[PDB]
């Protein structure tokens, strides 16, 4: 019936195998017995703290489960990260869902903090949280639509995973266009917006038939007169003309006077 929790007594012995069995049983029945399992807490805490225990990963997993049931999210995430492999990779259960959600929230906060102060002073990020976030990125990429992955990447800086999702199967460049608009009108960090525009201009240029109109709009946002001048000169050298004329008209319509003067001077030379 499992109406009692004497397994903690097994946790209290000295033989490591008995401790491992007690931990296994606790994790097997921890979904229902948090009420009394929480009070022991320190008994399983010492198991992870000690580096000589054979199954420290399972101890970390059980501690994370108990703390998640108790409601303490910070220590639950800490201990879930402490555990390896089986800690969260199962990505199947509700506990896994909540732990991964909290992990992504913590990682995004850390990423924003690091981006704010990235000149070597950025706080180090544990490889465990980074791995969990990367696994979440891969899952959201290979599972279904990649827009959610594009959103998470933008949230956590991480322009590398963002560039990849845009250039991955991606279905269509309509998603690259969706990314262009979202960064355009739904962003507030000028440096981060400029970095996103750099990535979206590189992706545009690498396309088989480049979207010159959108690339020039991004360039005018990014204040890169030399790039636009070189693009126009190369397009003229490539004998396109009509695209050059439309691109020039759009540039004049939206670009500033100083930008236009810089482009004019670049073309003249």
């Amino acid at each position: 019936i499992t109406s009692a929790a004497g397994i903690i007594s097994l946790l209290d012995e000295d033989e490591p195998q008995l401790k491992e069995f007690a931990l296994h049983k606790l994790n097997a029945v921890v979904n229902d017995f948090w009420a009394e399992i929480s009070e022991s807490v320190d008994k399983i805490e010492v198991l992870y703290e000690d580096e000589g225990f054979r199954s420290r990963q399972f101890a970390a997993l059980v501690a994370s489960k108990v703390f998640y049931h108790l409601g303490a999210f910070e220590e639950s995430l800490n201990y879930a990260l402490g555990a390896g492999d089986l800690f969260n990779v199962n990505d199947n259960s509700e506990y896994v869902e909540t732990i991964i959600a909290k992990c992504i929230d913590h990682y995004t906060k850390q990423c924003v903090e690091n981006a704010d102060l990235p000149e070597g002073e950025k706080k180090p990020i544990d490889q465990r949280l980074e791995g969990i976030v990367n696994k979440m990125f891969q899952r959201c990429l290979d599972d279904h639509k990649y827009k959610q992955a594009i959103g998470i990447a933008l949230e956590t800086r991480r322009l590398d995973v963002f560039e990849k999702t845009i250039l991955e199967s991606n279905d269509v460049p309509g998603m690259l266009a969706y990314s262009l608009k979202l960064c355009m009108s739904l962003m507030q960090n000028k440096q981060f917006r400029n970095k996103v525009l750099r990535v979206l201009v590189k992706i545009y240029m690498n396309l088989e038939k480049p979207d010159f109109i959108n690339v020039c709009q991004c360039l005018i946002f990014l204040d890169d007169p030399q790039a636009v001048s070189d693009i126009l000169e190369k397009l003229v050298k490539e004998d396109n003309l009509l695209m050059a004329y439309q691109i020039c008209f759009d540039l004049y319509e939206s670009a500033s006077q100083q930008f236009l003067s810089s482009v004019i001077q670049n073309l003249r030379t």
Binding site: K147, Q148, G151
Partner: protein, 32 residues
């Protein structure tokens, strides 16, 4: 979609916060 919804909700929450602060300050001034 989902990301746009999330960020639009965040912006709406911030705008509501600023509106609430404005309303509270104006209520104090109106009491004076």
């Amino acid at each position: 979609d989902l990301y746009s919804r999330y960020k639009k909700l965040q912006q709406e929450l911030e705008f509501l916060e600023v509106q609430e602060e404005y309303i509270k300050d104006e209520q104090k001034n109106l009491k004076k």
